[PDB]
Write a protein that binds this ligand. Structure first.
Ligand SMILES: CC(C)[C@H](NC(=O)[C@H](Cc1ccccc1)C[C@H](O)[C@H](Cc1ccccc1)NC(=O)OC(C)(C)C)c1ncc[nH]1
Lengths: 99, 99
């Protein structure tokens, strides 16, 4: 679909049976979700934005559906203020930026 | 142009007769530039990202050309890791997300 940026680009995603709102972020290299339980083994990582760095748990090969499109990739879980779908899964659904 | 997201969406912006590289960020409500000298008065702003909040200086009605498109708006200057073109200027050059 075409999405305007007059308003923040929030979409419903489905992860582990749970439905959630997530921000489509082209400034985000990786996808970061708010604290949750994901199966499998994770490794620790430190990621930085405005304001600095936060510690997250990295899970690889997690399947997530973004508006009906299935996508699989690394998902970071940690104390993020909002769920963010980064470039690593935006490319998988064919998302591009146009003007 | 159509920009895919396999790489970070970086463009050249011209501000103050100077060229710089900035990130097109749909996840940023505002535009934040690394420390620089801009004309006029400024007023204070608190902005929060993934690592918490930073205090920045707000300048209004600044001309900035993003890929040969002249935009005129609010630019925040402060301790950002990278120059960020936010939604307030991405809407003025007609940018949308498509998949
Ligand atoms: C973990 C992701 C989110 C992170 N990117 C961001 O935080 C980018 C900026 C950046 C890019 C590249 C290197 C450093 C900083 C900004 C995000 O788009 C964030 C997403 C967000 C929205 C709402 C609340 C909290 C966060 N937007 C954001 O911080 O907005 C402002 C206006 C403060 C710039 C990233 N990408 C690469 C390294 N870190």
């Amino acid at each position: 679909p075409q999405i305007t940026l007059w308003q923040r680009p929030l979409v419903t995603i489905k992860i582990g049976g749970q439905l959630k709102e997530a921000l489509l972020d082209t400034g985000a290299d990786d996808t970061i979700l708010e604290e949750m339980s994901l199966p499998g083994r994770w490794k620790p990582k430190m990621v930085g934005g405005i304001g600095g760095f936060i510690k997250v748990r990295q899970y690889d090969q997690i399947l997530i559906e973004i508006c009906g499109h299935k996508a699989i990739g690394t998902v970071l879980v940690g104390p993020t203020p909002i769920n963010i779908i980064g470039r690593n899964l935006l490319t998988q659904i064919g998302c591009t930026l146009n003007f």
